[PDB]
From a paper:
The PCDN family is a lineage of antibodies isolated from an individual participant in the International AIDS Vaccine Initiative’s (IAVI) Protocol C, a longitudinal study of neutralization breadth in HIV-infected individuals. The donor in question, PC76, developed a broad serum response targeting the N332-glycan supersite (also known as the high-mannose patch), one of the key epitopes on Env, which involves N-linked glycans and amino-acid residues around the base of the hypervariable region 3 (V3) loop. All thirteen of these antibodies have a cysteine (Cys) residue at position 100 k, which is located at the base of CDRH3. One PTM that has been less frequently discussed in the context of therapeutic antibodies is cysteinylation, in which a cysteine residue in the antibody forms a disulfide with a free cysteine molecule.
Two crystal structures were obtained for PCDN-16B subpopulations of mass 48,207 and 48,326 Da. Both show well-ordered electron density, allowing for comparison of their CDRH3 structures. The free amino and carboxylate groups were oriented in such a way that no obvious clashes or geometric restraint violations were observed. We also noted that, despite the presence of the cysteine adduct, no significant differences were observed between the structures of the 48,326-Da and 48,207-Da species, either in the Fv (Cα root-mean-square deviation, RMSD, of 0.38 Å for 214 residues, where 1 Å = 0.1 nm) or in CDRH3 itself (Cα RMSD of 0.28 Å for 22 residues). Closer comparison of the Cys100k residue in both crystal structures of PCDN-16B shows that the lighter species (48,207 Da), while not having any density indicating a covalently bond adduct, does show evidence of a small chemical entity proximal to Cys100k. We modeled an ethylene glycol molecule into this density (Figure 2(a, c)), which, upon alignment with the 48,326-Da crystal structure, is superposed with the cysteine adduct of the latter structure. The density could also represent a low-occupancy cysteine in the 48,207-Da model. The corresponding mass spectrum does indicate some presence of the cysteinylated species in this population (population iii), further indicating that this Cys100k-proximal density in the 48,207-Da structure could represent a “less cysteinylated” population rather than a fully “non-cysteinylated” version of 16B. Interestingly, the PCDN-16B Fab also has a potential N-linked glycosylation site at HAsn52; however, the data show no indication that this modification occurs.
Residue numbers in the entry:
A (entry chain A): 0 to 27, 27A, 28 to 94, 96 to 214
B (entry chain B): 2 to 82, 82A, 82B, 82C, 83 to 100, 100A, 100B, 100C, ...
The structure:
Amino acid sequence: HEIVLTQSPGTLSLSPGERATVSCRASQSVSASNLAWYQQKPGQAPRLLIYGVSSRPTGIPDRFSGSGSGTDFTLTVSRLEPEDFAVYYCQQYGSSPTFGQGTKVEIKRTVAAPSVFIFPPSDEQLKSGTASVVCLLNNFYPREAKVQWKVDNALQSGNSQESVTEQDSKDSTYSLSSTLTLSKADYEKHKVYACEVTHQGLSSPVTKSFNRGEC
Amino acid sequence: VQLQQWGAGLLKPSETLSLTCAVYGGSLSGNFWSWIRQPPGKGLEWIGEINHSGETNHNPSLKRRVTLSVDTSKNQFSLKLSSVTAADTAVYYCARGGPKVYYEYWSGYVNNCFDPWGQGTLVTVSSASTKGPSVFPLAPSSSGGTAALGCLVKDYFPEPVTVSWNSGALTSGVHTFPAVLQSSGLYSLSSVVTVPSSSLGTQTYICNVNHKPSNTKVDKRVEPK
């Protein structure tokens, strides 16, 4: 019976000097003014940003403000500074404490399509009985990209894992790797291994592939 | 007021996690004191709180597993989490919660938000044994212009591994991805770099992989196949 806090949007893409606005909605009314906001930079603990719906603790600049009541609350940053790009959480304390899921504020830049590369498993690894096929998406923006694995046209599901870098400090792009893992026996049953990439920067999806056992 | 925390780091499933937080520059009697965790890449979850007289409130989903305690003479408070599983892997924070107030007609604790916060302690729960990685080449293919190559660093435990290229002399265009936790309980990552395709015949690329927990060091030269 906890109060569930839902933030929107999940991600804000903005530039310094622009306004950020984060919403926090509750599954039940928050009593009195019992809502707080936090900012969290990577590798750091969260930092109290707003309390009592709209109050700033000492040291919080006045570009941060909060509003709302009941089930609907808002955090806003009037004009973003570079240090403001971080994850922001709401928290209620009218009931047993709960947090929103967080809203990431990232740097907005022009769309950049990913450069795609596919890597077959090495002979050495195959000797050990496992095949890792790696697909690389390099230096793209926005972060939203879809990688599908298609093995002889068959759409794979449940046998891949992805990893994404944090936004680059110099060009504000992201990079992503997808790794398809099969046993050696399964790997040798197929021919075409294809990595299909969907991204806003691409006029149509990009497919990179290789035929097993060939140069 | 400043908080310092410490405790276990690596645990195996079914163990008891124990952590302690020390308060400096203030007394425990003025506030409720909380524990809050954050699984890697996830959000924040309140665990429970305790005040100076030992009164406690718990996250209802964790209440049966949580034991909180307070040492008023040392100005410390502690968290015990029993029967840990891999799902308990998280950074655990201690934090000062709401103050105790004495109003004319009412006394108790109010404004239960969190300030300040401890620096956090990463606790990892796993049944895996310490294991160094295997390093495999991600070979460059074959106008063009740009080529990609890398190293796959597979099946190690625990975190972390470091990767450099050419003993640190190659940094531009390198991406070393965050590790992923495989279903086996072992970690895996890749480190890639983009290079001019024209120089593939005369340039050498070596990834330097170091796994301090297993005292492992591997240099892998990555060549076209």
